[PDB]
Amino acid sequence: RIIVVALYDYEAIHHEDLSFQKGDQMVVLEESGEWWKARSLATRKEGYIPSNYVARVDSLETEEWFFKGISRKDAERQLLAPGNMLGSFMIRDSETTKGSYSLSVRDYDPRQGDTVKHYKIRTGFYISPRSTFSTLQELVDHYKKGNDGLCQKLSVPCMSSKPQKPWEKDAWEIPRESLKLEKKLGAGQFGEVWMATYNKHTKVAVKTMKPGSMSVEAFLAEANVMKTLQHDKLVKLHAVVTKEPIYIITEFMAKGSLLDFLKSDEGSKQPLPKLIDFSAQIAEGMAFIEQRNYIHRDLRAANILVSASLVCKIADFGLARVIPIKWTAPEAINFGSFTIKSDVWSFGILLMEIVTYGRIPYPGMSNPEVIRALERGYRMPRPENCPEELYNIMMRCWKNRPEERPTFEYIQSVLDDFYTATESQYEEIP
Numbered sequence: 001r002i003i004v005v006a007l008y009d010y011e012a013i014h015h016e017d018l019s020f021q022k023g024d025q026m027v028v029l030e031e032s033g034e035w036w037k038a039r040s041l042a043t044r045k046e047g048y049i050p051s052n053y054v055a056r057v058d059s060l061e062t063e064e065w066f067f068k069g070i071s072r073k074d075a076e077r078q079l080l081a082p083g084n085m086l087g088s089f090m091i092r093d094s095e096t097t098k099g100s101y102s103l104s105v106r107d108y109d110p111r112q113g114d115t116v117k118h119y120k121i122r123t124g125f126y127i128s129p130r131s132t133f134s135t136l137q138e139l140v141d142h143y144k145k146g147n148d149g150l151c152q153k154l155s156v157p158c159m160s161s162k163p164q165k166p167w168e169k170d171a172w173e174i175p176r177e178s179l180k181l182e183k184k185l186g187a188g189q190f191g192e193v194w195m196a197t198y199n200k201h202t203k204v205a206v207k208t209m210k211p212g213s214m215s216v217e218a219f220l221a222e223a224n225v226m227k228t229l230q231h232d233k234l235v236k237l238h239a240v241v242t243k244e245p246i247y248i249i250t251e252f253m254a255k256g257s258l259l260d261f262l263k264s265d266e267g268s269k270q271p272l273p274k275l276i277d278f279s280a281q282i283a284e285g286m287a288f289i290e291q292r293n294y295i296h297r298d299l300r301a302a303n304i305l306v307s308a309s310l311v312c313k314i315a316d317f318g319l320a321r322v323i324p325i326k327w328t329a330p331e332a333i334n335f336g337s338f339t340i341k342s343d344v345w346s347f348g349i350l351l352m353e354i355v356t357y358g359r360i361p362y363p364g365m366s367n368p369e370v371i372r373a374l375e376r377g378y379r380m381p382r383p384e385n386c387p388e389e390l391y392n393i394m395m396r397c398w399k400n401r402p403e404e405r406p407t408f409e410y411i412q413s414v415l416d417d418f419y420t421a422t423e424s425q426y427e428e429i430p
């Protein structure tokens with residue numbers, strides 16, 4: 001007998017799922033992934049619920065200040081998001097000491113501006129050995145009144161949002177009829193991209209492929225692999241229409257591409273540490289792809305999507321294997337040798353695209369002119385706004401020998417703490 005509680009409001013939009021409000025208790029009848037079968041204690045209706053909108057009663061995730069599954073860097077980003085203030089805090093899982101918790105608090109010093117500082121909580125719980133607490137609420141309730149040591153006293157828990165609703169149960173392959181493609185977003189040499197609607201009540205984005213040599217069969221073989229590359233900085237692949245012409249249904253990304261975003265009004269008021277934060281997100285996306293032994297092939301700003309809350313996501317991973325040299329590494333251009341290391345090269349140019357607010361690479365140069373410029377060891381110069389240490393990453397990304405190029409793991413780690421010294425990652429307190 002298991003009892004869960006609703007963390008958010010949810011409105012039913014399918015045949016057999018349930019409507020519930022925040023605070024609603026319900027009984028778990030069945031566990032099966034993103035959708036669970038429950039029994040509402042307020043309506044007594046048996047039906048389906050999203051398994052990420054609930055958690056066990058009295059458990060840790062029921063608390064407003066607790067954030068499950070957040071890395072130190074995610075906590076920093078969520079707490080620097082609009083709607084938070086001094087003392088905005090969260091207790092979360094430790095990313096380094098597995099099974100322990102960490103406190104992240106929004107601070108301000110006039111020399112850097114707003115920051116997020118992190119504290120390790122030790123197993124009973126304590127941050128300062130001087131002061132121990134029985135529960136995590138006792139901890140919180142203490143530092144909430146004055147800061148017995150902290151950079152700031154605790155004010156209000158961090159701003160959260162609804163997680164995205166999980167795609168319908170067993171619906172990887174859908175009939176084309178479910179779609180209303182409402183507006184063309186883009187059109188290229190291989191197909192179109194549309195804002196659409198799935199079964200009247202779910203906004204999505206649809207990539208329609210122009211029926212080329214891309215074998216029906218051979219595509220699904222690769223699409224079923226893209227379905228398994230689920231990361232927060234990879235775009236979410238929802239479904240697929242299996243009959244030629246092929247449709248690719250993904251999550252709708254409000255702000256379009258990174259390229260069109262950097263070139264826009266709102267994109268031009270992004271300070272440099274945000275541009276780097278963007279890069280960090282992408283390097284996290286690639287580190288995952290790298291971890292998973294996989295290849296992007298077409299890494300550039302036009303294939304990176306931006307969401308309404310400015311989270312960066314990677315699109316068309318792999319597509320180039322199934323289906324523009326200024327982004328392409330020499331070995332890839334010369335002998336068709338695409339590796340994760342040729343992506344690192346592509347990541348260097350994207351880095352520059354970011355730092356130049358989307359400006360075309362090698363300005364004034366032709367594709368042939370670029371190729372001969374490379375073979376003589378020419379590289380792009382550092383622009384006015386680029387810090388010197390960020391140029392090194394680009395220059396390291398652009399080494400003649402693939403093996404000499406850094407990993408996305410190391411790149412992510414450098415970009416993540418770009419403004420922080422290793423020693424300042426966690427504040428130590430006596």
Ligand SMILES: CN1CCC(n2cc(-c3ccc(Oc4ccccc4)cc3)c3c(N)ncnc32)CC1
Pocket residue numbers: 185186187193205206207226235237248250251252253254255256257260305314315316317319
């Ligand atoms: C002008 N322009 C075309 C439309 C625009 N775009 C593309 C996409 C897009 C790109 C690829 C895509 O399909 C795949 C994603 C990952 C792997 C394979 C295919 C789905 C949507 C998109 C989106 N989801 N939401 C909002 N805007 C989007 C990007 C810039």
Ligand SMILES: [Ca+2]
Pocket residue numbers: 423424425426427428
């Ligand atoms: Ca320290």
